Design a protein around this ligand. Structure first.
Ligand SMILES: NC(=O)C1=CN([C@@H]2O[C@H](COP(=O)(O)OP(=O)(O)OC[C@H]3O[C@@H](n4cnc5c(N)ncnc54)[C@H](OP(=O)(O)O)[C@@H]3O)[C@@H](O)[C@H]2O)C=CC1
Ligand code: SF4
Ligand code: SF4
Ligand code: SF4
Ligand code: SF4
Ligand code: FES
Lengths: 164, 100, 101, 121, 115, 688
């Protein structure tokens, strides 16, 4: 029996991605970036390929690598660029063309997707493998009965009994 | 003796190898068999032994003014890496001299 | 003083939104040469003070040349009165004159 | 064994020590840590209201400081910010025990003070 | 829905508590907010600016605010000779609110039956 | 094996799970994120939130998946009408007394309660009664407590009792009037006290310095590393524009799990004060603002005006590997061989990395049932490492200490306090040796303050003797470990940032240089910085070194760049730039390269990747980012090779093995400029 989030449009997005002929397309390095028509200096900067780690504020795990096949969770970012403030108001002033386009739009299911995207676009890229979460607990308090086992202070000594 | 001479020809001697590589066996043998005596004569000379997985064996020496030479010693023997160190010492006498 | 004028408060690549940190007052700004001088200074991101004697109609072309808060219009300038001159340069470390007849 | 650590011998830089943000009685212990932002540092401003208010106009802090605390029967008070609840703030339930005219409970939404002489005092 | 304005409580304290719902909801990005805790422990704004040249007067800010702090006043004749005069700060918004409070309160006394 | 992985079914899905796992863990392995409020990964099972209720066949009642063990053949259902009904009822019971404080609550936008109510809750409420009003509590200036918001998930109590070990918080009252906090007015003495707010799933516990400052979605999250110590905790930086707003820890089991020192939590405030933005050159009137061209020319003239033996370079605590290697190449290229480190023991020989690292690693340390401490205070050297030590203590690991007896939040055995006691232990005079000689995986750890002793060779020789006698290092195991308290020390050791023997001799007879360069150093001794000597300072904060300096170059702070930093175990980590450069600041290695070009000897590299490749050529492991190699071991040949250094400067049996760290809350200029640390110091001083 197969059941992997089998009650949504995502299946319709699973297929039409594996269409024969359409699934064999390939482009060379920097080739897609030529088709972009953007200024050529865009490819000179460095980019970070990664998945953001789970925030400490919440126990939520949806926007994490745990549901990797469910949602595209690989992000491409750029080095932040010079920023300053408006003399008249104090608002943050900057000239970065690539300021937010990645953190808002660029989302990928696997790291290899972003690798191919950068290669076909010519963006030099860094890979940062996210740390794996640990599910195995500690030896102490391993089970609910460990909160009240004998390991806390050892076996009770029967020396204070009447007649000892 | 070359060991006593290995204090004026260069200012630093650096060694690169791999813990588990087959071609790194010889440099491992040489270091194990010679590090104690190569340091006993000069108790302050910098001899940086560094290792990493998948790397390549090489002997690199630092000279005055930052002059530096390197020789790969992958696939050699303990006697062979000793020979390479000997050529390293040989070039060390014909170097610019600093400190003064 | 030597190069601190053009370097200390320079913020940005040098565009309209950039800040050169330079405060200057130009006299005869609405004149032929002064207009281009002001347009050149402000376009690098500098604060410009423009006091004028002629009409605001002849001076409105200067308003576009600077960003919000960097074009200072001081009407009814009197060259015989030093009060307006003192107000014109009260914040500018640079003074430029093109008043000619 | 395990001797105590002398906290008073620790050297403290004078410049940093004298710019710690402290607070009036208000809603907290007097002189506790006050959260501050980087705004106003370039202009060298160490007052919250001075960041946005100009001149000697009456501050909202002075306005609310002119309202005496309110005496209400019971242990829990309900604050809406207005006579009709929908015109003010969300309803707040504020504890009244252990509160006095000297030490009342101030509204977190509106800043109004309340107290009750019902907790056996 | 006219000129945005900041409202107070009848004792005199600002209604805005810097929950930043107005800035979050604003699709015009015309609201800039900075805030910290006041010296009395109160949670108040340190910078409250709305760009009228950028504000679209949608009133979604007035819909989002749960304390009736930000309101679009019945003032609509506020054109200026320079664009800089329309860069509304906290002080001018508070001035507008203090000016137009009675009319806004009267309108709310009607709009409360619908809002 | 007797089937260590048992099988169950969750919604008709077979999932293989380890024995002793819970239904919560099974559903996690099933790809379901069950709503939960009180359970945590690092804490004991509480099971009072009732939010983990699920349905199991042949069971009439909902079962506590956060606590229910999984039996073989079990069937688990998570979408039945009763499941949703129970979830909605539980949420309603949560929200009836909760105060309507979301507009003023700081956790709005990252509130687990809010999202769980949105998903698993309803939209309407039928509660119209008066709520329960709870007075707030004072625990110190670090955490703001809004007790009325508390849902009594008990996470604070479990955390304080287990991780911190202070056990200062509890549950007072009963029923609805159950109350959380301390019966008396107490200040939270926990050094890892800021983790509770992150562990608090609601706005009841909030960071007082962060209160009412900005919102979660207003921030840009940048994953960074902690440079306040030598452990290098993985953290995320949240900022609004160019200003840092808060810094939060991130998951790294092998380094810091989910924990951060409060020093590394609240020292971001200092980035707003005493900041160097412009180059300064000392004129007749004093230091004045000057261009980078002018400052670089003045520095080049000062450097070239003196002989190579009259130039000294010192590396601070927060200098990165790139700037360190660039400056080392610069000074070497001009015939200078005077190198110093602000972290001390700049003359310590560094030939084998294992000799100055933790060979058991931090996570491999948890395999040891017996641990030996030699003159270290991990509580004030690395509170996260101390917390991991406590976690190891919690399941039978015994710890011995040789040095100053200090509070370490767990029971231990004090063998002694001086090297004579260490010699007695190695001789066989103490019972602790036989316990060491019988332990299957013994561990020995030495702090950096030992390395600051003038007789460090003798102490190392004694430690090696004890390790050999107890077999601490053997096949498949290495309990020998070396730790540190500053990040820049490890990279300097690995890159060979050590003074020449000629410079060591020159110090020995008392030669005094004239050109002194500081790379972000502010805790130098007076003996390395002669008065009347020209000082070239590079940094990002105005401090003691900056004041005495003659030429100042505004550098880059760790929150503004991406520098390489290796922790004491030898794992390469790098920071990340979260906000742009402040003022006219420049890249540190770019600054040094510019100076090299101006002087007349260009560095052969012109890019960040180029200097990193130069580092890799110097030491191959630098390329492996976020990993660690297994260091080689050379047995007693190293010790027998450093015997002469032991002969000179013999052992001092009287000096106790203490910790040189005397001010936890202030160790560097950034800590010395932070307001929050000063507030904590005053609070700890107002308790008497
Ligand atoms: N080839 C050239 O044009 C040369 C120019 N120069 C100098 O360049 C400057 C400008 O040249 P150009 O701009 O072409 O000449 P313009 O006549 O075009 O500039 C005249 C400016 O002088 C102002 N002005 C003159 N007298 C007064 C006054 N008494 N009170 C106030 N404002 C006054 C005018 O103001 P209003 O508009 O109200 O009259 C106008 O702004 C002059 O100073 C001239 O000497 C030098 C050499 C050659
Ligand atoms: S105006 Fe209203 S919605 Fe906007 S920040 Fe203030 S209280 Fe919140
Ligand atoms: S009315 Fe609309 S555009 Fe104007 S401030 Fe409110 S939300 Fe923004
Ligand atoms: S803790 Fe969450 S639900 Fe409770 S008041 Fe704060 S934001 Fe609202
Ligand atoms: S204060 Fe926070 S952590 Fe403690 S019981 Fe209440 S909700 Fe849980
Ligand atoms: S996690 Fe199950 S009741 Fe708390």
């Amino acid at each position: 029996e197969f059941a992997t989030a089998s009650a949504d449009y995502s299946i319709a997005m699973k297929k039409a991605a594996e269409i024969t002929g359409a699934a064999e397309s390939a482009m060379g390095p920097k080739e897609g970036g030529f088709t972009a028509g953007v200024p050529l200096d865009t490819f000179t900067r460095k980019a970070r390929i990664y998945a953001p780690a789970r925030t400490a504020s919440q126990s939520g795990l949806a926007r994490t690598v745990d549901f990797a096949t469910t949602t595209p969770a690989w992000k491409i970012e750029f080095e932040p660029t010079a920023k300053w403030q408006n003399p008249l108001m104090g608002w943050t002033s900057s000239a970065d063309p690539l300021e937010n386009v990645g953190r808002s739009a660029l989302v990928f299911y696997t790291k290899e997707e972003a690798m191919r995207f950068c290669e076909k676009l010519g963006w030099e890229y860094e890979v940062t493998e996210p740390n794996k979460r640990r599910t195995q607990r500690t030896k102490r308090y391993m089970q609910y009965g460990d909160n009240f086992g004998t390991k806390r202070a050892g076996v009770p000594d029967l020396s204070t009994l009447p007649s000892n | 003796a070359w060991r006593n001479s290995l204090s004026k020809s260069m200012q630093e001697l650096r060694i690169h190898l791999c813990q588990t590589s087959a071609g790194s066996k010889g440099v491992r043998d040489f270091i194990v068999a010679n590090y104690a005596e190569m340091k006993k004569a000069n108790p302050h000379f910098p001899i940086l032994i560094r290792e990493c997985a998948g790397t390549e064996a090489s002997l690199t020496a630092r000279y005055d003014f930052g002059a530096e030479k390197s020789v790969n010693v992958q696939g050699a023997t303990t006697g062979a890496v000793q020979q390479q160190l000997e050529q390293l010492i040989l070039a060390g006498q014909s170097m610019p001299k600093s400190g003064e | 003083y030597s190069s601190t004028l053009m370097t200390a408060d320079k913020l940005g690549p040098g565009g309209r939104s950039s800040v050169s940190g330079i405060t200057a007052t130009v006299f005869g700004a609405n004149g032929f040469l002064g207009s281009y001088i002001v347009n050149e200074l402000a376009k690098r991101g500098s604060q410009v003070v423009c006091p004028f004697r002629s009409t605001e109609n002849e001076a409105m072309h200067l308003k576009q040349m600077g960003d919000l808060g960097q074009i200072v219009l001081l009407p009814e300038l009197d060259i015989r009165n030093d009060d307006d001159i003192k107000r014109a340069i009260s914040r500018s470390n640079v003074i430029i004159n093109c008043v000619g007849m | 064994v395990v001797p105590t650590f002398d906290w008073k011998k620790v050297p403290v830089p004078s410049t940093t020590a004298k710019d710690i943000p402290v607070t009036v009685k208000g809603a907290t212990p007097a002189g506790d840590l006050r959260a501050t932002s980087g705004l106003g540092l370039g202009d060298g401003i160490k007052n919250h209201t001075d960041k946005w208010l100009d001149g000697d106009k009456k501050s909202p802090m002075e306005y609310i400081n002119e309202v005496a605390p309110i005496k209400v029967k019971g242990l829990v008070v309900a604050s809406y910010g207005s006579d009709d609840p929908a015109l003010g703030c969300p309803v707040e339930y504020i504890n009244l025990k252990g509160t006095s005219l000297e030490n009342p409970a101030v509204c977190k939404y509106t800043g109004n003070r309340y107290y009750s002489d019902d907790w056996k005092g | 829905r006219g000129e945005h304005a900041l409202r107070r409580y009848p004792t005199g304290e600002e209604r805005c508590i810097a929950c930043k719902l107005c800035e979050a909801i604003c699709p015009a990005q015309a609201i800039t907010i900075e805030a910290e805790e006041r010296e009395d422990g109160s949670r108040r704004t340190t910078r409250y600016d709305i760009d009228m040249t950028k504000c679209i007067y949608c009133g979604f800010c007035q819909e989002a605010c749960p304390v009736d702090a930000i309101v679009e006043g019945p003032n609509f004749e506020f054109s200026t000779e320079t664009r800089e005069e329309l860069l509304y700060d906290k002080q001018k918004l508070l001035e507008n609110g203090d000016k137009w409070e009675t009319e806004i309160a009267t309108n709310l006394r009607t709009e409360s039956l619908y809002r | 094996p007797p089937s260590d992985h048992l099988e169950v079914f969750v919604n008709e899905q077979p999932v293989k799970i380890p024995k002793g796992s819970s239904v919560l863990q099974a559903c996690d392995a099933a790809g379901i994120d069950i709503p939960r409020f009180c359970y945590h990964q690092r804490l004991s099972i509480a099971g009072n939130c009732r939010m983990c209720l699920v349905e199991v066949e042949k069971v009439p009642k909902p079962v506590a998946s956060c606590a229910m063990p999984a039996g073989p053949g079990m069937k688990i259902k998570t979408e039945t009408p009763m499941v949703k009904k129970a979830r909605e009822g539980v949420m309603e019971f949560l929200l009836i007394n909760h105060p309507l404080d979301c507009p003023i609550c700081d956790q709005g936008g990252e509130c687990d309660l809010q999202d769980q109510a949105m998903i698993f809750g309803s939209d309407r409420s039928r509660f119209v009664e008066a709520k329960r009003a709870v007075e707030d509590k004072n625990l110190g200036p670090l955490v703001k407590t809004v007790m009325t918001r508390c849902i009594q998930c008990t996470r604070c109590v479990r955390f304080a009792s287990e991780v911190a070990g202070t056990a200062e918080l509890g549950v007072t009252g009963r029923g609805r009037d159950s109350e959380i906090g301390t019966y008396v007015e107490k200040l939270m003495g926990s050094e890892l006290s800021g983790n509770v707010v992150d562990l608090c799933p609601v706005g009841a516990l909030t960071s007082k310095p962060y209160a009412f400052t900005a919102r979660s979605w207003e921030l840009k999250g940048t994953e960074s590393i902690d440079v306040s110590d030598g452990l290098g905790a993985n953290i995320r930086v949240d900022a609004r524009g160019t200003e840092v707003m808060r810094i939060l820890p991130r998951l790294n089991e092998a380094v810091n799990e989910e924990w951060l020192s409060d020093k590394g939590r609240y020292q971001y405030d200092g980035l707003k004060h005493q900041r160097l933005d412009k180059p300064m050159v000392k004129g007749p009137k004093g230091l004045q603002v000057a261009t980078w061209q002018d400052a670089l020319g003045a520095a080049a003239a000062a450097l070239t005006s003196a002989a190579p033996g009259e130039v000294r370079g010192i590396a601070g605590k927060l200098a990165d590997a790139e700037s360190m290697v660039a400056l080392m190449d610069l000074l070497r290229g001009l015939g200078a061989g005077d190198l110093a480190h602000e972290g001390g023991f700049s003359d310590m020989p560094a030939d084998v990395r294992s000799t100055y690292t933790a060979n058991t690693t931090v996570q491999g340390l948890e395999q040891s049932d017996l641990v030996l401490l030699v003159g270290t205070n991990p509580r004030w050297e690395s509170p996260v490492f101390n917390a991991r030590l406590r976690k190891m203590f919690l399941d039978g690991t015994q710890v011995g200490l040789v040095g100053a007896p200090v509070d370490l939040t767990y029971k231990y055995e004090h063998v002694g306090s001086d090297p004579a006691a260490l010699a007695a232990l190695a001789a066989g005079q103490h019972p602790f040796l036989e316990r060491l000689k019988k332990a299957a995986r013994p561990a020995v750890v030495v702090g950096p303050g030992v390395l600051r002793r003038a007789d460090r060779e003798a102490v190392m020789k004694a430690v090696h003797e004890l390790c050999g006698k107890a077999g601490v290092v053997k096949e498949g195991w290495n309990g020998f470990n070396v730790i540190h308290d500053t990040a820049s020390r490890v990279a300097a050791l690995d890159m060979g940032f050590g003074p020449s023997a000629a410079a060591r001799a020159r110090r020995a007879q008392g030669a005094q240089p004239k050109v002194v360069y500081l790379l972000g150093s502010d805790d130098y001794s007076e003996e390395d910085v002669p008065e009347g000597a020209f000082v070239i300072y590079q940094g990002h904060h105005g401090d003691r070194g900056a004041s005495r300096a003659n030429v100042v170059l505004p550098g880059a702070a760790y929150t503004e760049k991406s520098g390489l930093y290796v922790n004491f175990e030898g794992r390469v980590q790098q920071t990340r730039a979260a906000v742009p450069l402040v003022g006219d600041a420049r890249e540190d290695w770019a600054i040094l390269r510019a100076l090299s070009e101006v002087v007349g000897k260009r560095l052969p590299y012109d890019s960040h990747a180029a200097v990193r490749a130069r580092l890799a050529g110097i030491a191959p492991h630098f390329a492996n980012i976020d990993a660690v190699q297994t260091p080689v071991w050379l047995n007693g040949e190293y010790v027998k090779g450093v015997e002469a250094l032991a002969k000179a400067a013999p052992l001092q049996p009287s000096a106790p093995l203490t910790s040189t760290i005397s001010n936890f809350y202030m160790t560097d200029a950034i800590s010395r400029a932070s307001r929050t640390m000063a507030k904590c110091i005053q609070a700890r001083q107002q308790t008497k």
